[PDB]
């Protein structure tokens, strides 16, 4: 049905870019449609921070739909922190436009080495209102109210390493994205799209561990203790600091990650968090399982999982839509 899929342009399969637009002159912007956060920001012409010299900086004075605020804010992600000040304007995402309260970053120095070396200009959240800094009603939630799209929900379909594109459809569930079945899980809370799963792969079972489906995380995630015993086996190598372990790809002891909620079980095979590391001898590949510690035992199910199952997000259904992405 009628909607609007925002083509996300993959990068080494560990982050994907979209094409946002702000203001009347429709100032273009390479965004990251992230669900781990619920705030939209763009670097301001006032961003005197180096990692800003190499990108599209928003220019208020060039937009007639630019409303002033100026309240200062911060936003802490895993890759760093950014700071600037509130402003409001007409944001565009494909065939849809809407007046949204967003942020103009002025300070991004904290987001290095990530920012200064990537291609996205800013971030556009997609999480829940109570996770946003400011209690900003979520973009997609908004376009629902204003009777602008079939349903209040978006869709995530990503390619692998390369192969083909990926899309972010806002509104309705495009069925050409998954093969057959589609199951739904409640939510624990309305922050990050989070569920109550029993995460495990080896003999490491954990009850109701918090699992956050995240488009903005490029790696899966378990805490330190839950991983220190990961070397209990897995002759995984630890290349110097950053970004994570690298192992041999024809190994034979790497356990299909098992994620299962009572209603249904989701399984992830090694093939998902491997390779390339080819030119650098094609018999080696990167693990792609980082040790991240949030609050409690929070597991970050990022791309790898979304790389297997085509996902559906809905504020209305108030849950996530899991189902095998269809490599077609």
């Amino acid at each position: 049905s009628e909607n609007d899929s925002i083509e996300l342009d993959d990068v080494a399969n560990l982050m994907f870019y979209g094409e946002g637009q702000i203001g009347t002159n429709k100032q273009p912007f390479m965004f990251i449609f992230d669900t781990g956060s619920a705030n939209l920001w763009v670097p301001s012409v006032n961003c005197d921070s180096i990692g800003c010299s190499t990108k599209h900086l928003y220019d208020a004075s060039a937009s007639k739909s630019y409303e002033k605020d100026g309240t200062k804010v911060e936003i802490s992600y895993g890759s760093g922190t950014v700071r600037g000040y509130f402003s409001k304007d007409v944001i565009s995402l494909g065939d849809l436009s809407l007046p949204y309260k967003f942020i103009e970053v002025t300070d991004a120095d904290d987001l290095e080495p990530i920012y200064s070396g990537s291609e996205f200009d800013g971030i556009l959240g997609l999480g829940w209102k109570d996770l946003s800094i400011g209690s900003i009603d979520p973009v997609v939630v908004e376009l629902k109210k204003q009777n602008k799209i079939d349903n209040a929900l978006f869709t995530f379909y990503l390619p692998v390493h390369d192969k083909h594109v990926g899309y972010l459809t806002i509104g309705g569930i495009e069925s050409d994205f998954y093969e057959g079945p589609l199951t739904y899980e409640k939510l624990n809370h309305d922050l990050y799209w989070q569920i109550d799963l029993d995460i495990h792969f080896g003999k490491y079972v954990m009850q109701k561990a918090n699992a956050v489906v995240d488009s903005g995380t490029s790696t899966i995630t378990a805490p330190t203790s839950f991983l220190n015993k990961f070397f209990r086996d897995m002759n995984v190598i630890k290349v110097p600091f950053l970004p994570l372990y690298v192992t041999t790809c024809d190994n034979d002891d790497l356990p299909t990650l098992e994620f299962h909620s009572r209603n249904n079980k989701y399984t992830l095979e090694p093939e998902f968090y491997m390779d390339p590391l080819s030119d650098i001898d094609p018999a080696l590949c990167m693990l792609y399982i980082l040790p991240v510690d949030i609050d409690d035992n929070t597991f970050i199910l990022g791309d790898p999982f979304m790389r297997k199952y085509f996902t559906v997000f809905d504020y209305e259904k108030e849950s996530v839509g899991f189902a095998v992405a269809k490599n077609l």
Binding site: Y77, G127, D214
Partner: peptide
């Protein structure tokens, strides 16, 4: 990579 809010 990136691990997008805390």
């Amino acid at each position: 990579x990136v691990v997008x809010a805390x």
